[PDB]
Amino acid sequence: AIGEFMVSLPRMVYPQPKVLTPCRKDVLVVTPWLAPIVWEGTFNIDILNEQFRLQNTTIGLTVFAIKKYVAFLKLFLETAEKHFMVGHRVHYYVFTDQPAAVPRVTLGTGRQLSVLEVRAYKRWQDVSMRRMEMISDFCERRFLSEVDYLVCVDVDMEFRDHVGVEILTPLFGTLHPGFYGSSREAFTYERRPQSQAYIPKDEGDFYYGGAFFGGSVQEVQRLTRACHQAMMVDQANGIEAVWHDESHLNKYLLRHKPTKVLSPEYLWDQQLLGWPAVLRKLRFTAVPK
Amino acid sequence: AIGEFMVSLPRMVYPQPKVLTPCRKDVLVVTPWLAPIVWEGTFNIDILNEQFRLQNTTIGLTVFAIKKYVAFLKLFLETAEKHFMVGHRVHYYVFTDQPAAVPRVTLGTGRQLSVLEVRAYKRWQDVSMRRMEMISDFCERRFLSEVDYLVCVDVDMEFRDHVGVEILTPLFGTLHPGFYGSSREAFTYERRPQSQAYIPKDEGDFYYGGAFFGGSVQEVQRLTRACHQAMMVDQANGIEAVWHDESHLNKYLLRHKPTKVLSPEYLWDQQLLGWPAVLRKLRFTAVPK
Ligand SMILES: CCCCCCCCO[C@@H]1O[C@H](CO)[C@H](O)[C@H](O)[C@H]1O[C@@H]1O[C@@H](C)[C@@H](O)[C@@H](O)[C@@H]1O
Ligand SMILES: CCCCCCCCO[C@@H]1O[C@H](CO)[C@H](O)[C@H](O)[C@H]1O[C@@H]1O[C@@H](C)[C@@H](O)[C@@H](O)[C@@H]1O
Ligand SMILES: [Mn+2]
Numbered sequence: 001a002i003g004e005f006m007v008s009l010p011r012m013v014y015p016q017p018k019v020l021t022p023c024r025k026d027v028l029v030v031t032p033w034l035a036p037i038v039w040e041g042t043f044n045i046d047i048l049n050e051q052f053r054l055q056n057t058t059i060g061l062t063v064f065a066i067k068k069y070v071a072f073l074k075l076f077l078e079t080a081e082k083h084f085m086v087g088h089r090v091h092y093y094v095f096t097d098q099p100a101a102v103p104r105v106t107l108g109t110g111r112q113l114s115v116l117e118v119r120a121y122k123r124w125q126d127v128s129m130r131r132m133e134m135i136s137d138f139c140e141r142r143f144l145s146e147v148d149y150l151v152c153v154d155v156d157m158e159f160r161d162h163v164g165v166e167i168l169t170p171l172f173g174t175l176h177p178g179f180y181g182s183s184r185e186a187f188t189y190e191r192r193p194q195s196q197a198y199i200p201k202d203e204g205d206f207y208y209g210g211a212f213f214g215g216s217v218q219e220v221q222r223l224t225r226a227c228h229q230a231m232m233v234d235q236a237n238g239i240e241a242v243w244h245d246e247s248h249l250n251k252y253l254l255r256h257k258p259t260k261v262l263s264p265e266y267l268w269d270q271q272l273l274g275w276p277a278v279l280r281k282l283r284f285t286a287v288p289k
Numbered sequence: 290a291i292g293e294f295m296v297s298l299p300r301m302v303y304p305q306p307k308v309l310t311p312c313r314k315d316v317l318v319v320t321p322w323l324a325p326i327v328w329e330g331t332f333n334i335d336i337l338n339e340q341f342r343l344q345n346t347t348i349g350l351t352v353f354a355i356k357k358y359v360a361f362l363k364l365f366l367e368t369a370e371k372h373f374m375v376g377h378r379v380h381y382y383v384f385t386d387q388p389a390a391v392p393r394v395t396l397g398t399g400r401q402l403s404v405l406e407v408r409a410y411k412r413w414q415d416v417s418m419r420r421m422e423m424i425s426d427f428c429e430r431r432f433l434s435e436v437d438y439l440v441c442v443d444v445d446m447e448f449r450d451h452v453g454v455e456i457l458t459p460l461f462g463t464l465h466p467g468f469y470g471s472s473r474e475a476f477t478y479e480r481r482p483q484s485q486a487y488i489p490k491d492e493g494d495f496y497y498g499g500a501f502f503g504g505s506v507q508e509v510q511r512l513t514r515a516c517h518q519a520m521m522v523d524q525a526n527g528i529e530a531v532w533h534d535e536s537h538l539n540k541y542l543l544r545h546k547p548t549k550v551l552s553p554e555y556l557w558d559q560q561l562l563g564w565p566a567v568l569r570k571l572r573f574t575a576v577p578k
C-alpha cells in the first residue's frame with residue numbers, strides 16, 4: 001500500500017550528498033512547482049529501493065496490443081523482465097483483441113501477467129484514444145485491489161536500461177523526446193479553441209509524451225476518466241484533437257501538475273534522435289520500424 | 290485538508306520552465322531520495338499559492354515562550370504577520386508558562402492565535418527537549434482538527450523575508466546554518482552508542498536544525514512522539530544527547546527521510562555567519578543577543 005505507517009530504514013553506507021555541488025549542471029532537475037525531474041545522477045537507487053520495498057509496493061504495467069501490435073509483445077515483456085522494477089512486485093496487464101497471440105514469456109518471482117480481452121477499433125487513432133476509457137474502467141475494477149501504482153506505456157518499445165521505483169509518485173508525465181528543448185510556442189498542443197484539449201500559445205510547461213505516464217491508482221483513474229470524458233465532448237462537437245489521447249494528456253497535466261516528471265531517458269527513439277550528451281542512459285526506446 | 294480531490298488550476302501566464310538550464314548552478318536542489326531542497330530560484334510561488342489555496346490549506350505554527358523567552362514574542366509574531374504564509378489560513382500556537390505576558394499582536398484576516406499554558410522546567414535543556422512531548426500531546430488533541438500542516442520553530446528569531454507554501458510537504462527538515470558545507474564526520478551528531486540518538490561517522494545525509502521542522506499533522510505527531518520516546522529511554526539510561534532534541538531530530542530524519550529539505554535561507558544567523566553569495570534571501574534569522 002501507499003501512505004501507510006513506515007518503519008525505519010536500516011543503517012546504510014553511501015556517499016554523502018554534496019550541498020554545494022549541483023547533481024546536474026546541464027539540465028533542470030526540479031520543476032517550478034517543486035516536482036523532481038528524473039535524470040541519471042539525481043537519485044540513489046539503493047535508498048529508493050529500501051523505501052519502496054519496506055512498503056511492499058506493487059506496480060501495475062498496462063500495455064495495449066491490438067491487431068498487428070501483438071507482434072511487439074515478446075520483446076516488450078522480455079526486456080521489461082530485465083529492466084522494469086526488478087526486485088519489486090509487478091503485475092502486467094495486457095489488453096488485446098487476440099488473447100491466443102500473447103507470447104508465453106518466462107517471469108521472475110513475484111511477477112504476474114493478466115490478459116484482458118477488449119474490442120478492437122478500426123481506426124488506429126481510436127485504438128490509441130480508447131486506452132483512456134479502458135484503463136479507467138479497469139481501475140475501478142482490478143487495479144484498486146491489486147496494485148499500488150499504475151504505469152501506462154506504448155507496446156512498440158523495448159527496455160534497454162533501468163526503469164525502477166525512482167519514477168513512482170502520485171502523478172507523473174514524461175518529457176516527449178522530440179520536444180524537450182523546444183519553446184512552448186513550438187509544442188504541438190491542440191490549438192483549436194473548439195476542442196477540450198486546447199492550450200493557447202502562451203501557456204504550457206512541457207510537452208508530455210502519450211507513450212509513458214502513470215502514478216497511484218487513484219490519480220491515474222482521475223487522469224484517464226478526465227481525458228476520456230474530454231474526448232467524448234470533442235466527439236459530440238465533431239472535433240478530434242491533433243495528437244489524440246496525447247493532446248488530452250497534455251491539457252490534463254497543464255491543469256493538474258505532475259508530482260514527478262520523467263526525463264527523455266524514459267522515452268526515446270535512437271533511430272530518429274541519436275544519443276545526445278544530455279542522456280547518460282537510454283532506458284525505454286522505440287523499436288526500429 | 291490534504292490529499293483531497295483537487296480542481297483544475299486556472300489559466301496562468303508565466304515564464305516557461307527551461308529543461309536545458311539548471312535552476313541553480315551553485316547548489317544541490319534535490320536530495321538523492323528525490324526530495325526538493327528549497328532555495329530561491331527553484332520555485333514559482335504563484336503556481337504553488339494557487340495549488341495550496343485551492344485546497345484551503347491551514348498552517349499551524351508552534352512556538353515556545355517559557356520564562357524569559359516571552360520577550361521574543363512581539364517581534365516574532367509581528368514579523369510572522371508580514372512574511373509567514375500571507376494569504377493562507379494560519380493558526381499560531383503559543384506555548385507559555387506566562388499567558389499574561391503574551392503581547393497583543395494585531396493579526397491579518399484568516400489568522401488566529403491560541404495561548405497554551407504549560408509547565409516550565411528548570412533546565413533550559415529540558416524546556417527545549419520537552420517541546421517534543423508537548424507538540425505530540427497537542428497533535429492528538431487540537432492540531433488534527435484545526436490545521437493541515439504544522440511548522441515548529443524557535444521563538445528567539447524574526448522573519449525578514451517570504452516563508453510560504455513552498456515549504457509544505459508531509460515531512461520537512463532544515464539545513465542547519467553552521468554545517469551546510471560540512472562533511473558528515475564533522476557533524477555534531479550524538480556519537481555515543483549508548484544513546485538512542487547515536488549516528489556513526491559513516492552515516493548521515495545532512496545536519497538538520499532543531500529550530501525549524503514540520504510537515505503534515507500526522508507526520509509531525511509521528512516525529513515528535515518518536516523523539517520523546519527516545520529521550521525517555523536515554524533518561525532511563527542516564528544519558529543526555531549532546532544537542533538534546535536536535536540530536537534526536539537528526540536521528541529520526543536519517544531513518545525517515547524528509548519529503549522536502551529547506552535551505553539555510555530558512556534558518557540563519559547573520560551576526561555569526563554574514564551573508565554568503567549562496568543565499569539570495571535571508572528569510573528567518575536569529576535575533577542579535
Ligand atoms: C523540431 C523537431 C521536430 C522533430 C520531432 C520528431 C519527434 C516526433 O514524434 C512524434 O511527435 C508527435 C507530436 O508532435 C506524436 O507524439 C507522435 O506520436 C510522435 O511520433 C512517435 O514518436 C517518435 C519519437 C517516433 O518514434 C515516431 O515513429 C512515433 O510515431
Ligand atoms: C565549522 C564551523 C563551526 C561554526 C558553527 C557555528 C554554528 C553553531 O550553532 C550551534 O550549533 C549547535 C550544533 O552543533 C546547536 O544547534 C546550537 O543550538 C547552535 O547555536 C544556535 O544557532 C547558531 C546559528 C547561533 O544563532 C547560536 O547563538 C544559537 O544558540
Ligand atoms: Mn508507436
Ligand SMILES: [Mn+2]
Nearest residue numbers: 443444445575
Ligand atoms: Mn536560540
